[PDB]
Amino acid sequence: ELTLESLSNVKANSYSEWITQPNVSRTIARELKSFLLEYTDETGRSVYGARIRTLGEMNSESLEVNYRHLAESKAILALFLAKCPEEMLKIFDLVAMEATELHYPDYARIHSEIHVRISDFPTIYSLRELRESNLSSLVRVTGVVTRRTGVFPQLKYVKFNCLKCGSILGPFFQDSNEEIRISFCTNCKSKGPFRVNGEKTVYRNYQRVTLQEAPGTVPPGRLPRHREVILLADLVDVSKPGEEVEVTGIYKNNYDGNLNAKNGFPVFATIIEANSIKRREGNTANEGEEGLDVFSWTEEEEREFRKISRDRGIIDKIISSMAPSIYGHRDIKTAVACSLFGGVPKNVNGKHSIRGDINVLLLGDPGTAKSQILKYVEKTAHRAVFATGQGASAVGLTASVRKDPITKEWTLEGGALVLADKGVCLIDEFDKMNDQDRTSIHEAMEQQSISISKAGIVTTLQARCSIIAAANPNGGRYNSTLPLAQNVSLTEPILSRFDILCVVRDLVDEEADERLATFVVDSHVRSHPELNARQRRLQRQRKKEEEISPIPQELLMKYIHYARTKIYPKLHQMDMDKVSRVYADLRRESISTGSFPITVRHLESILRIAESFAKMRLSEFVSSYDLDRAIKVVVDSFVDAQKVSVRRQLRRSFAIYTLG
């Protein structure tokens, strides 16, 4: 037997042969199993044991292992994995399955093999800087998905049969990029016809994708580069055409006759076999964080969620934690939080569908941090799409029709509203936009679907998306002596579809200006860029978050994701008379004096906001406090969009409902 000290010295003048030796491969497996079983973090809890426990619960087929953990301890194995992926991964999958069969015996009846997904590889390359020295090694490459072939079954253990000797050949592992070539018989001793051994075989899922370089990475004015990526089983359909992705994989080469024929030199083709996939569409928090999905939670994190969810005033802290560095504008923050958490969709007897998402509009003076709030919402949301003004078209926010280059049949392609299904679409400068482009979202805002009838395609899509829009008033500035209908160009059909409207006014006030200036100067002071040091960095970065954020942002992201995924509150016991009276009063005080369209569509927004406030508390039933808070929000959103003449009377008239 060998020791971790003995793996340092190498023989055979090649690392692959050194790894594949029988004596070395027995020490490697034992060391990998010890790493899997005995690793503990700072708090003292084994992480891979918990991951294995969750694997069986979720009926998963893959295990995620961080490269930093295996590099910090047993760094020689980390170097071996870095240089020689193919041989290390076969052993590591086997040891992973052996470790898994210590928590779930008889798990082989569910899945027969456990795959390992590597995460947080240190060195990141671009497609432009790939050379021949990276051949047969693990690489990390960012790109943009362009085209996807589709899922087909592929042979796994290939068999052959020869007729004159009737010989059956042993199973062959297919390279997945090179056809199995066999010409010699162990029995026939000569060339013979070979069959595929019809039936009695094992298949795998296979797919192929093309990655172009991201426009941000490409130097301005230069042509992009592309490469081909092969996705095997458990990795199919994860990436979608149009998204931006980061892939960790193995860089390989193969001989192509056409490439040699056209160029005129013995050049080879290259392709990447994908190992790990991470989505980066809309994510600017990629500067930090560890893992393949930063919106996923562990068991202790869920327990912490349920612990902090029962504190009184959780809603106040959640609201205060929205865009902490922006000063004031608490109504905007409340509307943003309500939109982010969202309502509950409904279907009554399978024939009547009711939408459950909140849309927000921000109409305000220039220089009031609306765009920064939109950027914060983009960063925090799980799925987010951004658009602005004249840069969007009718079919750029909807589905488009294209001729498939391969199949040559008319096909549907995605858009901004489809890329943000169960997400958020943000539209900055929503008033500086063509009417034909603006009117394309009428169906998606309410019916949450898209219908296309073009070139023989008659289909209906699904876009369960929420819209937060920012606009400027006529003349660039809001006239408080005029009603709303003469401060904007939008008509009733599009104004009715919005749930919350926030009018932002800039007024002269010495104390307010002094406080805002002090806050902004302190913020600029804070953000100036000037045990293990890598954790000293974390503690210093947490100290700065302590002042202005009641809860950390990374915790809040997982909190929002868990709340949206798991909770579905109901409305069993509530006061119908109060809501009916509020709706009737709001309808009466609109035609008499007002220019804010109120229909039945605004009655349901109160219930949606109540369900959102219930979601904020991780409660399964809506209480009276949440409904009262929703009524107060709706009433304050209507009173503050009036003329200065009647605002004082309307506020007094509507004040009886919001007694608390």
Place this chain on the structure above:
Amino acid sequence: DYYLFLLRHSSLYDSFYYSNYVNAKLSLWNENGKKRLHKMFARMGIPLSTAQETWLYMDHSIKRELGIIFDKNLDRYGLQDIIRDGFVRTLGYRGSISASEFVEALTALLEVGNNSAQKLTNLRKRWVSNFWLSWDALDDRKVELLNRGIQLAQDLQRAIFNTGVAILEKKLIKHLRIYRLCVLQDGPDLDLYRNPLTLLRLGNWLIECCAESEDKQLLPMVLASIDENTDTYLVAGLTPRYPRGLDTIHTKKPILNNFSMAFQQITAETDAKVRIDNFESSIIEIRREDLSPFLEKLTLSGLL
């Protein structure tokens, strides 16, 4: 056979989900119980996709070895009491039926099938009418009615579970010194609890949930349900029950029901507008106005 709800006419996951004993032992009404059930199914070796198939079309190999899988795994989660022996009847090329499933189908047929005095009279007439529907299902010629009863039982158990989770999450059960009160005034589908059998179903769910609770007490429970059309509460008293798997040292003549004498004592002394006319003396119909005072008197009545 097993203490599972309609095993041979539904999936395995459904049988484990809608069982009183499993729910009591694992607390499935919240997320932790569901996660524990998923972990159990993962450990046992049955894929989650296979456990959700119909019993007839379930994999033959899994069905053959179900007994060993139960025996070797059920002990870890405290569910070793679900294994028992029963009676199964088969007639030709038709299919097997157990006694438990038959009685649940009959009870489902009893429960649902087919100026306030007339309103109560029509309800009682319909309850009388359901008797012949349950009677017809005992004849071998009428099997479609038995299948209809099975479907009705599944729907009824789903509704009972849905109401019970709402009762348990909002803490509607009030712990008084002498008894525990539960009054259902608001919510959906309160028109199913106008029948005594459905209220007994919900009470059996709640008592089963309370018996396996670590809290050691034997207080009787009171369950009240409103009917808007009649403006009357239907009120039932339920006796406590020992845990199913508990030893025989406490075994005796079971806990006695003392609600009949208390109700008669309160009714005789005061001119309350109560109706004690059912065969079961523990079920009464009290007008809406009299509920809150009457219960107060019960608090001082004693014998509970």
